[PDB]
Design a protein around this ligand. Sequence first.
Ligand code: NAP
Ligand code: NAP
Ligand code: NAP
Ligand code: NAP
Ligand code: NWO
Ligand code: NWO
Ligand code: NWO
Ligand code: CL
Ligand code: CL
Ligand code: K
Ligand code: K
Ligand code: K
Ligand code: K
Ligand code: K
Ligand code: K
Ligand code: K
Ligand code: K
Ligand code: ZN
Ligand code: ZN
Ligand code: ZN
Ligand code: ZN
Lengths: 352, 352, 352, 350
Amino acid sequence: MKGFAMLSIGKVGWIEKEKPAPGPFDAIVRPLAVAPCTSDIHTVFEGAIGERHNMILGHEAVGEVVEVGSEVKDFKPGDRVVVPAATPDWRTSEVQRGYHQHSGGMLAGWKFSNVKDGVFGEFFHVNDADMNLAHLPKEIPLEAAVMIPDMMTTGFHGAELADIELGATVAVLGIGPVGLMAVAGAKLRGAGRIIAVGSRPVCVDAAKYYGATDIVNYKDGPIESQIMNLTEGKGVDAAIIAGGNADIMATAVKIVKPGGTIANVNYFGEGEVLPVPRLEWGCGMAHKTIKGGLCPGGRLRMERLIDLVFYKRVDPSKLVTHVFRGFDNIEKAFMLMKDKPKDLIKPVVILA
Amino acid sequence: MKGFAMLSIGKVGWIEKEKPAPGPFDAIVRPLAVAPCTSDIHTVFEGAIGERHNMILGHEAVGEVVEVGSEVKDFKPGDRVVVPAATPDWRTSEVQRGYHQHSGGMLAGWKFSNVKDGVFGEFFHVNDADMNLAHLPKEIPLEAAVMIPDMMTTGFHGAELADIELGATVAVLGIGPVGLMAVAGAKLRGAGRIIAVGSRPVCVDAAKYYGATDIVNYKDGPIESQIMNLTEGKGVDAAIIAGGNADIMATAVKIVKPGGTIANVNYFGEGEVLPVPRLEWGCGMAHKTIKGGLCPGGRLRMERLIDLVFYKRVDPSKLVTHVFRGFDNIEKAFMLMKDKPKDLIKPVVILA
Amino acid sequence: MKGFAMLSIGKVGWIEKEKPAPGPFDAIVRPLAVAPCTSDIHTVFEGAIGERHNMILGHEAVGEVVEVGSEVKDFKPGDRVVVPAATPDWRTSEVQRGYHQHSGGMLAGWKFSNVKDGVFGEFFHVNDADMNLAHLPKEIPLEAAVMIPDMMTTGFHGAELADIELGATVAVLGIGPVGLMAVAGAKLRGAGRIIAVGSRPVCVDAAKYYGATDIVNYKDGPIESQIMNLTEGKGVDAAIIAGGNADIMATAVKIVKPGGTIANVNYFGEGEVLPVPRLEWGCGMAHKTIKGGLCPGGRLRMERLIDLVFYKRVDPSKLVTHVFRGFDNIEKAFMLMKDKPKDLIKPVVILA
Amino acid sequence: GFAMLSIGKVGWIEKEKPAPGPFDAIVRPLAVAPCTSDIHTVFEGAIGERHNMILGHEAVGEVVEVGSEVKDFKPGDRVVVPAATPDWRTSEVQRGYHQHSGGMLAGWKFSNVKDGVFGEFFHVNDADMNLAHLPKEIPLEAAVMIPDMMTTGFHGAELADIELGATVAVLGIGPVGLMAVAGAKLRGAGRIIAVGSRPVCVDAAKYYGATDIVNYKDGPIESQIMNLTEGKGVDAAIIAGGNADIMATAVKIVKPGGTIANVNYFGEGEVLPVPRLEWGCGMAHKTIKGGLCPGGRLRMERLIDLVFYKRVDPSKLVTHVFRGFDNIEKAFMLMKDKPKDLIKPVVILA
Ligand SMILES: NC(=O)c1ccc[n+]([C@@H]2O[C@H](COP(=O)([O-])OP(=O)(O)OC[C@H]3O[C@@H](n4cnc5c(N)ncnc54)[C@H](OP(=O)(O)O)[C@@H]3O)[C@@H](O)[C@H]2O)c1
Ligand SMILES: NC(=O)c1ccc[n+]([C@@H]2O[C@H](COP(=O)([O-])OP(=O)(O)OC[C@H]3O[C@@H](n4cnc5c(N)ncnc54)[C@H](OP(=O)(O)O)[C@@H]3O)[C@@H](O)[C@H]2O)c1
Ligand SMILES: NC(=O)c1ccc[n+]([C@@H]2O[C@H](COP(=O)([O-])OP(=O)(O)OC[C@H]3O[C@@H](n4cnc5c(N)ncnc54)[C@H](OP(=O)(O)O)[C@@H]3O)[C@@H](O)[C@H]2O)c1
Ligand SMILES: NC(=O)c1ccc[n+]([C@@H]2O[C@H](COP(=O)([O-])OP(=O)(O)OC[C@H]3O[C@@H](n4cnc5c(N)ncnc54)[C@H](OP(=O)(O)O)[C@@H]3O)[C@@H](O)[C@H]2O)c1
Ligand SMILES: C[C@H]1CCC[C@H](O)C1
Ligand SMILES: C[C@H]1CCC[C@H](O)C1
Ligand SMILES: C[C@H]1CCC[C@H](O)C1
Ligand SMILES: [Cl-]
Ligand SMILES: [Cl-]
Ligand SMILES: [K+]
Ligand SMILES: [K+]
Ligand SMILES: [K+]
Ligand SMILES: [K+]
Ligand SMILES: [K+]
Ligand SMILES: [K+]
Ligand SMILES: [K+]
Ligand SMILES: [K+]
Ligand SMILES: [Zn+2]
Ligand SMILES: [Zn+2]
Ligand SMILES: [Zn+2]
Ligand SMILES: [Zn+2]
């Protein structure tokens, strides 16, 4: 089997791997639709996770099960499934603590394109199929379903961490695909006013579609000053960080009111320290909670997000601005995430 | 002044009262729109809370401030306000515990038509105006605004108590006005599948409008078997009780899965005991949490729900099936709530 | 292999079974100390879980690993271990929801003396050793360690469910071994006043040792009136049910103040319905939360309770009023559990 | 009244007895205690410039006069006065954050926006909401630890979200940290690792439940704790002292999914550092909380029950007891010089 892989830092290319074999609890999946992510770019060209050699990229996929182990019971060859980006080992002490995202170590729940070959191949390996796969209903299109493995679960997690009360005012810092799902997530938690911060017009339109009531362009002035004018000095009840540099952490604390919550799902890939402003954090005593979490994975997380799409609570197809067909177009879609045109949100490659 | 009052258990009529006088922190409001509730029916004709004498009924009103105390700071005569059904004293020990609904004793946060003259009069008294009143934006119609004081905050409270996770399956037992707002609340908490139980078609249509994906009519068979068939034996993650007799508590426990939650906002006016089925409650060990709460009130609760209506997260005007004009039609609206025609959800009397 | 077994409903005795074989993830353990439970009595003489034939009884044991499967990684033959009473399958959807006690179905986390042979034999089988075993420190005596598998985790779970705030007043209804650990748990959650309800003097003395500040004997009058007099009408912030018939549920609701919590760990083995008093539950609106849960199990739960004993946070050896030596005295300890002398709390059998 | 004359200058002034509102009460102090906050206010300008402001915010006094609407307190009652006496009729109270009632940290009024307790009398706003009766069985030197030290340290333990048997590290074993050590024990902590150096504080930490002592004499705190937990880290870290860098140490020693609970007051620097890598680059589920201590009547009543029913003995914090109004100055000066055998000084006035 072939696979679009990271040869080394700054280099990508196709490689031939021996098709993987499933353990007694594992499954082999061929992809029906894949999507590249900004994480793949940070991994290859910035060394976000360190040095990697000959590692197939990609972690957002929808596929068909072709082979299962002798102990796999809920999945058989021919089943269309949604594969979460996080496929942890479910038999660790961190799972018994309630944090499967860190099963076996910090962020160790994320295996694809990290500690194992990713989904950008003719086949890929899923560990613990009965715990890390969810059946895909036929009524959900592939381009919509491939938004569930990473974009939907991450953005919604930012809304979960934000501890949104009914009618609260929420700010979403960054309206990329994750941020757009955070806006939709904030709406799904009963937020009243949703202030979205971003500039790209294609993102602003998608943000309004998902529930944003105000748009703050960080080109029209400082984010902090704009939001304080919108909220008439009250600030926001919660801020969801879905993009930006390390400085955006300071912006979030400044706009959240005392007792509120700063929920980060953004990946800070550079800098030794994330700044927390001393005065705006009450010198340590303002009850401004700061959370930061990896997206949940596993079967149950996927099944619940599938129900949200199935019952028309959120339509993630607005994230898909580019659709390609064919295994070869994985490279072009990946290079699109590196160039990042102003009309791109998320590209999807459809496979035979 | 005039006011539709409870003469005794089973008797209602107009009575003559002394126009109320405000304390230094209080406000006098004349009603602009009022709505009767089922609670008044349980109070008068079932003796659910005991004997009352010449107590003006009603607790759902949008009004105009006509007089304020010397220490009221945020409200002046002429301000259109939304008056929460629950107007507690905010300087008690129960408020410091986080349960203002029971400020001064069980259910003591609910004063109108309970321990104080209600809103069905030419004027009524609001205690602690700066803490128990919210300004009404011009953009919200009166017939919609009067759904906020009680119907919206109660139904949404059922959804809050239910501890709904994103994509969870929620059953709403009873789709009267409170149940319909519980359906809307469940959607606002990110519920996927929402199973609504009721029979009246006007309620069924409203349930579908507010987010119900399935309708269970308790005329077509036992509720438990229908819901267990719908969920393929899994049960529901949460059940919100918004109507029915004491037996509906047993129905809720039977359909909620182990680890789920039964959230009751229904007001049981008859029976000595609410039944909890032993076996289906795991003989005490199934982790099926049972909650039951009076609706939140106060200025902040009203302001947050106003933002939900203002930013078009929920449209409560669909609850209003009958609109009348005039003090005389308060009697007609109250009696409609006693007979409950098959086409009634919520009546509103406009006093423009 | 010898084993004390439930022959049928109402009959027990020693039988010879084929020594069990471990699966690749399992372990074979020989017991060093065991304890009978009230649950074993309900199973044999009341048919609580139905008819059983030649099922070895017992679920509280501390032992030595004698054999492990090829995939067990943290335990080798010779390791002294604490075996939790609940040894669930850790690869189910209920584990992903956070309720391992119901892994595979209601209460299905409890396997010993239910769906598999218990610990009252020369050897027993532990499923998923790396997830369901904890190492036993040498400094902890066997008679103390064998209180961890069930009594400590159940009683402490009652304290966890009660949502105890620092300085709150907690009542524990029933001071058997589980109730005594609920008293200790309430102290470990920062309870101020702890009112323990019981009659047997050996139980009263243990309750005082574990932190009880007041003793209510239900022979001196109704529990409700006694507790309301002690708290001067305030009631308690939480009530932990650790014993009694179904009527104790109504008693619990009557003494808890509005906004409090009723946390049940008791096993109700009789009655079709557990009564919840309508009026004292606020007619459904008193914010009196009712919880009821099976005890937590698994490796992490045992390791944490082991640390509580190791670092001298709780001494469970005071629960042990009878210690016998010898494999044969399992019969005497089990029968002692049925006769219930006034000086008995928990008996322990030491082996070899 | 012992007052802050200006930045760096203090002295006795004119006892202009305060007047109570209809809901307020005038209390004369029976026992007071100075805090590091009093020192930061005067000599570092922590809250800005003040003129003729009576200092002090930890006092157990007796109410001598009440307003016409005070119902639960009469002249002659011995009460515990919390350091935080917020206005209870604001929107932040309806959100559940009375410490910020009317603005960030606005729940703390004594020695901030009103004269403190180091005077012949002081003014307590909303007596029925900000006062608690003091049982006779509780000694004064023990009771005066409740208004600030006990409620702060216990708040650090509350914010930490401690599960039964969890491993908790307390960074800093001053009076607040010592109460955080006792608080973690009250929340069911198993192993409690205390970080500090002064011997009188180390002995108190073991008394309140600390199972390990990490001294910066044997190496960096991060390396020591990782060896103690054999690389597992701790489930929660309560920050009760140190510079801004202690925030980075806290993140490094807490395991993924744990909690950093800060009650420390950071008075210098523009930014508190959160280490990127050890915070999972933003995704390690290491929650960071930081809150002002709770106040009000209920908070005091709950902590009084803990002392009354002998759940915690705060008298071990009191290393020096003085008698007389004049020794308020000497006790205040101890907090500035900080002897190595001092934890908390108390001035008895009854
Ligand atoms: N926690 C998890 O499990 C998880 C999962 C997936 C991804 N992530 C990470 O979360 C982040 C989300 O990125 P993405 O997938 O949504 O694609 P993206 O296009 O890179 O998102 C960046 C968004 O933030 C905007 N932005 C840049 N700087 C900003 C600033 N100072 N303030 C406000 N907005 C700013 C960008 O607008 P402009 O075009 O003007 O720059 C854009 O709208 C990534 O870093 C990703 O690696 C985390
Ligand atoms: N917690 C609070 O603060 C608060 C506030 C306001 C009201 N309440 C109370 O909550 C309840 C809500 O009533 P409402 O105002 O929404 O008007 P409602 O029309 O009386 O609500 C009754 C609903 O329950 C249904 N019902 C009756 N018996 C049923 C059964 N065996 N099984 C299933 N459904 C059954 C009814 O079915 P049909 O469609 O056939 O009629 C209807 O859908 C009332 O008791 C009210 O007093 C509480
Ligand atoms: N949730 C779980 O996972 C779990 C685990 C283990 C056990 N359990 C069950 O929880 C219960 C705990 O029993 P145990 O192991 O602690 O032994 P136990 O000695 O049988 O406990 C009975 C206690 O409850 C008292 N009691 C009986 N009726 C009472 C009444 N009307 N009012 C007040 N107290 C009353 C008893 O009073 P006296 O002092 O007069 O006897 C005694 O103190 C058992 O039913 C057990 O099967 C549950
Ligand atoms: N959130 C609130 O409401 C509240 C209330 C009261 C006070 N506070 C503030 O919280 C802090 C608690 O201070 P305190 O009253 O308990 O007296 P303190 O003596 O100042 O407590 C400081 C503790 O931290 C130690 N320390 C200093 N640098 C350290 C470092 N790099 N690493 C580890 N430990 C270090 C100190 O050692 P030494 O023994 O050598 O000094 C001492 O043990 C103060 O800053 C206070 O202003 C907050
Ligand atoms: C950190 C990593 C988690 C899973 C997939 C995301 O894109 C990035
Ligand atoms: C009631 C029973 C359930 C599991 C734990 C022990 O076996 C007791
Ligand atoms: C900031 C200030 C709050 C109340 C009293 C404490 O000592 C410190
Ligand atoms: Cl496995
Ligand atoms: Cl006031
Ligand atoms: K907060
Ligand atoms: K489905
Ligand atoms: K539950
Ligand atoms: K508005
Ligand atoms: K409650
Ligand atoms: K140990
Ligand atoms: K956390
Ligand atoms: K007391
Ligand atoms: Zn991705
Ligand atoms: Zn009503
Ligand atoms: Zn047992
Ligand atoms: Zn202080």
